[PDB]
Design an enzyme around this catalytic site. Structure first.
Site, mmCIF file in Angstrom:
data_model
loop_
_atom_site.group_PDB
_atom_site.id
_atom_site.type_symbol
_atom_site.label_atom_id
_atom_site.label_comp_id
_atom_site.label_asym_id
_atom_site.label_seq_id
_atom_site.Cartn_x
_atom_site.Cartn_y
_atom_site.Cartn_z
ATOM 1 N N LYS A 176 3.118 11.131 -4.306
ATOM 2 C CA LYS A 176 2.264 10.809 -4.990
ATOM 3 C C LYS A 176 1.154 11.722 -5.318
ATOM 4 C CE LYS A 176 -1.589 7.539 -3.409
ATOM 5 N NZ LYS A 176 -1.883 6.478 -2.706
ATOM 6 N N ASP A 224 -12.771 6.039 2.623
ATOM 7 C CA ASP A 224 -11.115 6.016 3.186
ATOM 8 C C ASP A 224 -10.767 7.628 3.501
ATOM 9 O OD1 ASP A 224 -8.230 5.570 3.014
ATOM 10 O OD2 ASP A 224 -8.278 5.680 0.801
ATOM 11 N N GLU A 242 -7.009 0.764 -4.874
ATOM 12 C CA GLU A 242 -7.113 0.760 -3.425
ATOM 13 C C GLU A 242 -8.509 0.170 -2.849
ATOM 14 O OE1 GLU A 242 -5.417 4.608 -2.074
ATOM 15 O OE2 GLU A 242 -3.560 4.147 -3.077
ATOM 16 N N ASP A 299 1.018 -1.085 0.101
ATOM 17 C CA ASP A 299 0.209 -0.179 0.033
ATOM 18 C C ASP A 299 1.008 1.314 -0.044
ATOM 19 O OD1 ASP A 299 -2.024 2.029 0.781
ATOM 20 O OD2 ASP A 299 -1.472 1.906 2.876
#
Ligand SMILES: Nc1ncnc2c1nc(Cl)n2[C@@H]1O[C@H](CO)[C@@H](O)[C@H]1O
Length: 385
Positions: free
Chosen positions: A71, A199, A175, A10
């Protein structure tokens, strides 16, 4: 041996996690400091390059040479309004190399520039070395996760980060798909299943709606706030304690960088305590001008301080439902992902919005994505033989 082994990674915005599926169980691998999650930080110093916890711990003393949020840059062009807007808030330099952003830093006394994928490959190398130290042999096969809204250029740059790190990338999976795999939501036999993944991380909020039709996953909707997370709740605690220090001592600490950072780390810790206790205590020796800051905060006061932020998580949930053309009663499963979903008020608001419904939260929410990726990695490596 090693060729039949595969890991699940992850690769998060703020934290990264690595899992391995062996002997019928997923093991989330702890780093050399005993932590099951590692900060997505890379520090460049006068003698060394630091990755993870060691990099996060020296961010105060070296802000210009500590890279994070790679990211947010990966697979993007320099001119992208997302890149241009984000650059105004980072302490490190972001430069343009033929319409591609590079992070420019000072390393071992020399000026060095890195592509976002080279930065993410250093985080991936660390995750790979954490799994290798746990297993006792090198592991090279990996499943790496990405947000469901990542386009082809972002997925390709993530795969390239895996190549640079020395991993054989079996697959790049979304994800929310990894999270639904963690809960076994793709093994419920026949008939379409609607899953909502909520999330809430350190710096981002994502809502995903998936349909699982006979093993096949389909993203119906994605919604959220790329600039909402756990760090916004810490800042609300910080502001409160700065005003409380001002009322008790008639002194403003806000301009003292060291006082604010020590207060920020103590607030982060206190916030986590408030998830299992109804009160938390701050114990900061000599915070400002030799004055100890020994205080406490209730969960009720913390919920008041963050009230508007918690309630704002329900607008992307409604937005995702309308985009997916689904009503609340049409959602079969609710899955919690990200450490901030541990906040009891967040769970209460989400459960009440879904009419008192049960939440899937038995897997550590900061580990559910690595857990599912580790499961997918095992299935994929078995089929490869
Ligand atoms: N028990 C907790 N109660 C509240 N917030 C938590 C908790 N654990 C983590 Cl991690 N976070 C936060 O989750 C993010 C990482 O996923 C960070 O913002 C961290 O503080």
């Amino acid at each position: 041996m090693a060729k039949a082994a595969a890991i699940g990674i992850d690769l998060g915005t703020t934290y990264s996690c690595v899992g391995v599926f062996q002997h019928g169980k997923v093991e989330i691998i702890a780093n050399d400091q005993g932590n099951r999650t590692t900060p997505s930080y890379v520090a460049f110093t006068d003698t060394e390059r630091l990755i993870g916890d060691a990099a996060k711990n020296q961010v105060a003393l070296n802000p210009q040479n500590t890279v994070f949020d790679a990211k947010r840059l990966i697979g993007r062009k320099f001119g992208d309004p997302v890149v241009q807007s984000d650059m105004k808030h980072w302490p490190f330099q972001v430069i343009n190399d033929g319409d591609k952003p590079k992070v420019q830093v000072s390393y071992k006394g020399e000026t060095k520039a890195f592509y976002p994928e080279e930065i993410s490959s250093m985080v991936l190398t660390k995750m790979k070395e954490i799994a290798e130290a746990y297993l006792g042999y090198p592991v090279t096969n990996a499943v790496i996760t990405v947000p469901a809204y990542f386009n082809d250029s972002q997925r390709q740059a993530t795969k390239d980060a895996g190549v640079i790190a020395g991993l054989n990338v079996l697959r790049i999976i979304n994800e929310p798909t990894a999270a639904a795999i963690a809960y076994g939501l793709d093994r419920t036999g026949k008939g379409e299943r609607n899953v909502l993944i909520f999330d809430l991380g350190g710096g981002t909020f994502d809502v995903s709606i998936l349909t699982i039709d006979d093993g096949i996953f389909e993203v119906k909707a994605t919604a959220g706030d790329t600039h909402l997370g756990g760090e916004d709740f810490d800042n609300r605690l910080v502001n409160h304690f700065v005003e409380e220090f001002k009322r008790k001592h008639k002194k403003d600490i806000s301009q003292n960088k060291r006082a604010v950072r020590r207060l920020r780390t103590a607030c982060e810790r206190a916030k986590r305590t408030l998830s299992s206790s109804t009160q938390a205590s701050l114990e900061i020796d000599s915070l400002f001008e030799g004055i100890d800051f020994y205080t406490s905060i209730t969960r009720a006061r913390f919920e008041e301080l963050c009230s508007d932020l918690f309630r704002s998580t329900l607008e992307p949930v409604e937005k995702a439902l309308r985009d997916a053309k689904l009503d609340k009663a049409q959602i079969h499963d609710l899955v919690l992902v990200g450490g901030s979903t541990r906040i009891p008020k967040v769970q209460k608001l989400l459960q009440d919005f879904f009419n008192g419904r049960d939440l899937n939260k038995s897997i550590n929410p900061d580990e559910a994505v690595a857990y599912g990726a580790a499961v997918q990695a095992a299935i994929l490596i078995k089929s490869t033989r």
